[PDB]
Amino acid sequence: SMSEQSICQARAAVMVYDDANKKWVPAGGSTGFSRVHIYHHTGNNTFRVVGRKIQDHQVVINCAIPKGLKYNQATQTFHQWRDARQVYGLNFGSKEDANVFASAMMHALEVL
Numbered sequence: 001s002m003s004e005q006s007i008c009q010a011r012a013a014v015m016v017y018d019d020a021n022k023k024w025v026p027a028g029g030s031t032g033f034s035r036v037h038i039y040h041h042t043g044n045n046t047f048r049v050v051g052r053k054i055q056d057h058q059v060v061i062n063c064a065i066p067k068g069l070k071y072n073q074a075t076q077t078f079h080q081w082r083d084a085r086q087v088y089g090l091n092f093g094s095k096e097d098a099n100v101f102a103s104a105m106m107h108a109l110e111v112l
Contacts, residue, residue, distance in 0.1 A: 004041040008104035011093035012036050014051045014060045016086040024089055028053065028060035033093055036061070038104050047108045049088075063088060067112040071105050073098075 014027040014034050026032070036051035047065040052058060063083055072080050077098050080089045092098035 003043045004039050006037045007040050007108075008038045008101055010036050010090075010097040010101040011054070012051070012090040012097060012101070013093075015089040015091065017089065019086070026060075027051070027088070028058050034060055036090060036101065038065070038101070038108060040108070045112065047112065061088060065105070065108055065112070067109070069109060071102065071109070073102060 011033050013032060014036065015024040016027050017023075018025045027034075030053075032053055032055060034051040034053050036049060039048050039050055041047070049061055049063045049065060050059065051061040053060055069081055074080055076095050077092045078089060079092070079098060079102060080087055082088075090098075090101070092101065
């Protein structure tokens with residue numbers, strides 16, 4: 001697993017969209033900020049997003065990034081993308097967190 005490396009980290013609250021109730025809900029069950037990484041698995045050139053809550057280290061997101069993922073910068077601090085299972089949203093702690101993480105994601109998408 002040393003062949004999988006973090007290429008970015010940022011501070012964001014991770015939500016998922018509850019399709020049935022038409023509302024954003026905190027990923028993992030409780031609202032708060034996480035440390036969110038983009039990991040590059042160099043053996044098979046894959047990427048995933050993994051986030052853990054700062055206070056308790058709960059894993060709140062573990063989401064593939066496949067080739068062609070559409071990454072939407074909805075606002076300067078809220079970005080989102082789809083998975084068959086749910087839409088994910090990142091409410092970043094700052095604009096720099098958001099831009100840096102995006103530029104990282106755009107890089108990932110270009111090397112996939």
